[PDB]
Design an enzyme around this catalytic site. Structure first.
Site, short mmCIF file in Angstrom:
data_model
loop_
_atom_site.label_atom_id
_atom_site.label_comp_id
_atom_site.label_asym_id
_atom_site.label_seq_id
_atom_site.Cartn_x
_atom_site.Cartn_y
_atom_site.Cartn_z
N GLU A 117 23.99 61.25 34.01
CA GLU A 117 22.54 61.12 33.91
C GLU A 117 21.93 60.99 35.33
O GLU A 117 22.59 60.43 36.24
CB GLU A 117 22.07 59.92 33.09
CG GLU A 117 22.42 59.98 31.62
CD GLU A 117 21.88 58.82 30.81
OE1 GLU A 117 22.62 58.43 29.86
OE2 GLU A 117 20.72 58.32 31.11
N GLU A 136 26.57 53.06 29.30
CA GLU A 136 25.96 52.11 30.25
C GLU A 136 26.20 50.67 29.93
O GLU A 136 25.30 49.88 30.05
CB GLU A 136 24.45 52.35 30.35
CG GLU A 136 24.11 53.64 31.05
CD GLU A 136 22.61 53.89 31.25
OE1 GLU A 136 21.77 53.55 30.36
OE2 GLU A 136 22.31 54.48 32.31
#
Lengths: 731, 731
Positions: free
Chosen positions: B446, B365
């Protein structure tokens, strides 16, 4: 001259049904007494549904020669029967109401055996039993017992009436109840000052009383009437107050002034010990509804409660709604006779309480029953024409024999159900519920409860909605002129039958937990306090970045009686006022901080580091409250907070002590699942388990005093905290 | 001939940065070892962020003459420097990858002192440190250490390639890595049976291999390549499998066949002990993901994990997504230099695992960073042409240097936010996310997690939603042909920094608790298996009257692979099929029993009592599963469930034992807040406190075997339960 003395000490208790006439073998106990102490949760509520036996040795005293010797039992659950040297002298099935055993004609020159048999069975002939009940009745001789030695001719009761109480010249009318004919002298007292006197057989009037004060919720002024029988020597005193309480279609009025009612229901139970909590504990509940929760009314859900509670409502200005023992079920003819007896016993014991302003004469949430309620309504009105009659229902179009349509309205929030087209509605319009076009007095007597169970440790988001729901209802009540007020369900989480609650024998319906520690919803009620009486400012947050969906603490609800609230976080300061658009009718609408006041960008919203916060409360541009939150809470203090550090040497006292797991700035650690290990030395015993479970970062305990003087020492321990010790001096 | 001994026993640990040359006072520890044990929740994650020191004393042996003597560290957190007799021999900053101290030249006769210094500090020069991290790194030599005695000419690594693996005549290509050029011999083995052999100076080829089997998730067939240097005597083995794994815009193909991917993210932490958990436990993690949750993929959030874990995945048919250490933060050029080294260390360690089918070469991320990611992309494809490159992000229009656009899509459920127009959506369409016109391989890596935290003990209505959201995303991924599959956030509740989670140092994101005991949501994943692999039927309820708003248990979600579920309570009996309309794309859609099958009006017949129930699972007309629920759950069985009944005397084993508070029909008491007093007797120490706190009516514990033979005896005690005892025989 009579002599009264509390006789709670020295009883013997045993399981089962023992021979009444022989010495009982069992443990020495001090009343109040609960037969079977329960765990907090997941227990077999039938464990107390069986017979027990108590015994007291009473030595004959030559000073009782030619006098009546009586025991008053203030309450015992249930099916009570009392014997004196094997001879039965009274039996009294009801579990909430007093009864007298006259010993006089059965006493002998030495020791005498007074045996009391009880049974906690849910006997269908004894109201409220017969079917389901969303509470437990437990068992024991859970209220005081009094040894009374009376002259033959003696007072059994008195009624004090205050006709035309709002006048500058007041009148006290007294109707004594005596065992035989003769004079009764009365004295009106203001504490220790004698105001006036009158003597007479029959009804006794004091008129032309100038300079006295009204009993109200703000000024709880009380007077005493002392009654003396000059021939027998007997004396008794009855407190009352001067006050008017009118339920008109335009609203409830106290002393002629309008008052919107704002209340909670309150049970008389505690964790572990059931109903067996003495004067001090009873008085504390009254105080908490009145002060902490700033309600002007409480309801005794769902039975007659302790005289200590009611006395305490008299002394601090809390209005009461008291009803007969019930929970939906209506038994047969005989059952209904007993319920009608219950009405009589409720009102004859409690008719002098200025706090009581309405009688509940229906079984709670029963169906209608014309011939039954005709009877209860008639009897209530004959015994006490001075107070309004209610009776709680949860149905529309109910037969209104009573003066006030006292209704449990659970419409919030039915719109969750699948085939329900009707929008989210906090309260119904009165005409819809009553079915009567004509305006009638109307009081919402429960709301929320089972519609929105919220546990102490439930998520921040859920507790927010729980807060919102108490606020919505309170707001709709304050906004509807046709609604005299509203009483929430309920003050604290309570133990119930397997048929209700969360499978754990608990209904998570309180705004407070079962130790009467506030959850966030409590300060919805407390925040309505006027600021002169105290500053309330409680943010509805644990201040954690990822507790809530997405992250953050916005929208932040702040329950407060401040005129505006300031928010400081991450170098952003923003001042916000109470949300009037949303709760326009609340006395103290809460502050809600949200996207309208602060944006995402401003607080680096979801830009990774969690910051501390500061929340300050303002009143006329002056800072009156400060609440800090750290980003990184750590176990700093294990706080032991007894309700008192000093107590007299009195074995009636149940001392509440809260344990709170607190961070570096004194906030609770809400999700710390932990046992606080507790020890108590000194003249008091711990009730319930040795290890105390935190729920929502706090828990509580009661310590029953032994009645000796000494120091109580309370140690609490947990490996993440410094050892904590507290003392309470006794005597 | 090499000798390789596991050298985890007899180390000395001490707080602080001691003199490396001098003998160390400290405690004796058996590795894996965690430097500071932590409490479960609310603790100072800075408490390991400091230097520690370890010492091993190593006797010189005459049998080591001529040879190299090495220690292989499989992982140690962090900033590792190793000294032998006071001379530094290696420095390895990264905390997730192996490193070798060559001790040869600095040995002496008698005792030699090997000293390892580590520092748990979040040193900003060492990835993933620098800013915030939603996980803890702890500290310690938390993985195995190996003493290796090696000929001067010795193998250091080997790459097994399987070109043309789907053919009937297969090919094995080996590329040994040796200290100096020379002959290398190879035998290809199936366990103990030789298939083929060959020898050469360079790349070794074994061709025309018939009768062999592919590795799949359904058949995890492995083979071994034993390498021998014939001049020096050196021997090493390398395990592998024949499989192809292609990532196409049409989706993921394993062995030429489509496979929609269904996975979870998995960390390597446990409560208390951090990462310091041995082989058995690493394996247990892979087993639970592959069998209990029926995932076909696991992602190593967010770092290279244990060889024991990967080895286990090779053995059980579990695909792996593995990435370099990271959390969002990209540091400076020197920090990026280390992350490139990290790419090399991971891939050169792991390139023979048939389980691993994709490498993550971006910092989880992070923003884009062209220069940094060009380098990690290029190095990885150069070390390993055989596997597709991924790199987990959470932004749209990210620069795709990688073969697969690996996206964390947290769109569910943003409609919650006040300023969002867009209706509740489970997944974004791919073209909106990539910003690329043409189709590219795309994987959701995710979802959920912080968008919907749910604790173990959270309300029933909240777990329902938790279940639903895991279902909607699974359903959505399965339904979209442009999505190769999805991996959920996450397998278990994990400890974290102050910046994240509920304030308690936990992110409550797991579909299982921190012990890997399932919450309701775990059964969304588990129910996706074909019923030939085991029947699943898990109703999403605690079966309490008043747990939910209003009351009751409809709608009822039943997570199952059955083709029908039957509901039975109080004269309502209904058989219901899977809700294919709501979840058209799931392999095993749950059964939902709602108002379509049972009406509100119908439920009034129940009356006011709460009633037991019975849910039955039906498969091709036969009853294959029963779950009963009582109306009055009571403490019945305090169950102690170890994972294994027998074990070898192996000091590396961390045995998981679950504790469940069970009612009469064996259901958990979800809201019983209790501490279970534990006693472990025999050849194993209890990790963490000896008072285990139930959360959702269960909790867990790990027992570290001493390595002596005998009987582990576990006693679990609580005042409401009968005493319970489990035994585990160790030998």
């Amino acid at each position: 001259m009579r002599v009264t003395q509390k006789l709670n000490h020295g009883w013997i208790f045993a399981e089962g049904a023992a021979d009444p006439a022989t010495p009982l073998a069992g443990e020495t106990v001090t009343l109040p007494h609960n037969a079977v102490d329960l765990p907090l949760s997941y227990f077999d509520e039938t464990s107390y549904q069986r017979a027990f036996t108590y015994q007291r040795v009473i030595a004959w005293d030559d000073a009782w020669q030619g006098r009546r010797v009586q025991l008053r039992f203030d309450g015992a659950m249930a099916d009570n029967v009392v014997w004196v040297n094997g001879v039965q002298v009274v039996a009294h099935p009801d579990g909430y109401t007093p009864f007298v055993a006259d010993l006089t004609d059965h006493l002998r020159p030495g020791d005498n055996l007074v045996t009391v048999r009880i049974d906690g069975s849910e006997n269908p002939a004894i109201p409220p039993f017969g079917a389901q009940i969303d509470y437990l009745t437990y068992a024991g001789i859970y209220r005081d017992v009094w040894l009374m030695v009376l002259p033959e001719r003696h007072l059994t009761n008195a009624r004090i009436l205050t006709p035309d109480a709002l006048s500058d010249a007041k009148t006290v009318v007294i109707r004594p109840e005596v065992t035989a004919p003769g004079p009764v002298r009365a004295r009106l007292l203001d504490g220790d000052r004698e105001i006036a006197a009158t003597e007479g057989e029959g009804e006794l009037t004091l008129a032309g009383l100038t300079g006295l004060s009204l009993w109200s919720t703000d000024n709880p002024q009380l007077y005493t009437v002392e009654l003396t029988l000059p021939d027998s020597g007997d004396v008794t005193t009855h407190r009352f107050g001067f006050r008017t309480a009118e339920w008109t279609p335009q609203g409830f009025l106290l002393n002629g002034q309008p008052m919107k009612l704002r209340g909670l229901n309150r049970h008389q139970s505690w964790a572990h010990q059931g109903y067996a909590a003495g004067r001090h504990a009873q008085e504390r509940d009254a105080e908490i509804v009145r002060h902490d929760l700033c309600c002007n009314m409480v309801r005794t859900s769902h039975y007659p409660q302790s005289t200590w509670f009611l006395d305490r409502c008299d002394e601090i200005g809390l209005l009461v709604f008291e009803e007969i023992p019930g929970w939906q079920h209506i038994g047969d003819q005989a059952w209904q006779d007993r319920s009608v007896d219950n009405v009589r016993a409720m009102i004859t014991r409690d008719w002098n309480h200025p706090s009581i302003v309405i009688w509940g004469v229906r079984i709670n949430e029963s169906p209608d029953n014309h011939d039954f309620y005709v009877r209860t309504n008639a009897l209530a009105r004959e015994l006490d024409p001075t107070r309004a009659i209610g009776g709680v229902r949860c149905i529309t179009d109910s037969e209104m024999l009573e003066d006030v349509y006292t209704m449990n309205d659970f419409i919030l929030d039915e719109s969750e159900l699948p085939l329900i087209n009707r929008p989210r509605t906090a309260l119904r319009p009165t005409e819809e519920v009553t079915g009567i076009k004509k305006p009638v007095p109307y009081l919402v007597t429960e709301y929320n409860g089972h519609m929105f169970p919220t546990k102490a440790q439930d998520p921040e988001l859920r507790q927010m909605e729980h807060v919102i729901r108490h606020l919505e209802v309170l707001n709709a009540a304050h906004g509807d002129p046709a609604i005299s007020g509203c009483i929430g369900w309920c003050m604290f989480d309570y133990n119930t039958h397997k048929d209700f609650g969360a499978g754990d024998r608990i209904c998570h319906h309180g705004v407070m937990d079962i130790w009467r520690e506030p959850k966030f919803a409590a300060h919805a009620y407390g925040s309505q306090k006027p600021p002169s009486e105290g500053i309330v400012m409680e943010p509805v947050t644990f201040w954690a970045r990822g507790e809530r969906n997405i992250g953050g603490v916005l929208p932040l609800i702040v329950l407060t009686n401040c005129d505006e609230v300031e928010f400081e976080c991450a170098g952003v300061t923003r001042r916000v006022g109470p949300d009037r658009e949303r709760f326009p009718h609340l006395p103290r609408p809460p502050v809600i901080i949200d996207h309208r006041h602060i944006s995402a960008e401003e607080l680096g919203q979801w830009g990774m580091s969690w910051h501390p916060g500061r929340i300050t409360g303002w009143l006329n541009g002056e800072q009156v409250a400060l609440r800090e939150y750290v980003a990184d809470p750590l176990p700093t203090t294990l706080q032991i907070a007894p309700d008192r550090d000093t107590l007299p040497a009195d074995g009636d006292i149940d001392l509440r002590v809260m344990l709170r797991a607190l961070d570096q700035v004194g906030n609770r650690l809400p999700f710390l699942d932990a046992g606080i290990a507790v020890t108590v030395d000194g003249p008091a015993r711990l009730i319930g388990p040795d290890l105390r479970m935190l729920q929502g970062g706090t828990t509580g305990m009661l310590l029953r005093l032994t009645g000796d003087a000494g120091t109580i020492r309370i140690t609490a321990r947990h490996p993440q905290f410094p050892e904590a010790v507290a003392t309470v001096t006794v005597g």
